[PDB]
Amino acid sequence: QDGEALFKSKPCAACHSIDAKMVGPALKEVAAKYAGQEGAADLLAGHIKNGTQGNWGPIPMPPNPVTEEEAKTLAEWVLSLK
Ligand code: HEC
Ligand SMILES: [Zn+2]
Ligand SMILES: [Zn+2]
Structure with missing residues (x-):
């Protein structure tokens, strides 16, 4: 996929929209923030799979039921969002 x-x-989609802020940052805003940050795809891939907190606010993103390969696809897709 x-x-x-x-x-x-x-x-x-329980927590994110492509365009609007929901629980987590809008995915287009993630793309905007990491545009030009070397290494962002691998960083976001680990965050999507394993969870993270404190990059956007106090509410955490829990780990997600994704494989490495799914997390990488998702990270590269998120970074592509213009
Ligand atoms: C609510 C329970 C969430 C679900 C389900 C998913 N995400 Fe999320 N995400 C959420 C929050 C609250 C945050 C911000 C955390 C913080 O650091 O303040 C995020 C963050 C992201 C990011 C950006 C990470 C970064 O390093 O800046 C991405 C790319 C992201 N989330 C993607 C993502 C995907 C692909 C999800 C489905 C697999 C997903 N999130 C689930 C909240 C929640
Ligand atoms: Zn498609
Ligand atoms: Zn899967």
């Missing part, structure tokens, strides 16, 4: 397909088949 591609990034947009995984975005809908995994639980992401």
Whole structure:
């Protein structure tokens, strides 16, 4: 599956929109923040799979039910969002 397909088949939409702020940052805003940051795809892939907190606010993103390979597809897709 591609990034947009995984975005809908995994639980992401409970907390994220592509364009609007929900629980987590809008995915276009993640793309904007990490544009030009060397290494961002691997960083986001680990965060999508394993969870993270404190990059955008106090609310954490729990770990997600994704494989490495799904997390990498999703991270590359998120970074592509313009
Ligand atoms: C609520 C329970 C969430 C679900 C389900 C998913 N995400 Fe999330 N995400 C959420 C929050 C609250 C945050 C911000 C955390 C913080 O650091 O303040 C995030 C963050 C992201 C990011 C950005 C990470 C970064 O390093 O800046 C991405 C790319 C992201 N989330 C993607 C993502 C995907 C692909 C999900 C489905 C697999 C997903 N999230 C689930 C909240 C929640
Ligand atoms: Zn597609
Ligand atoms: Zn899967």
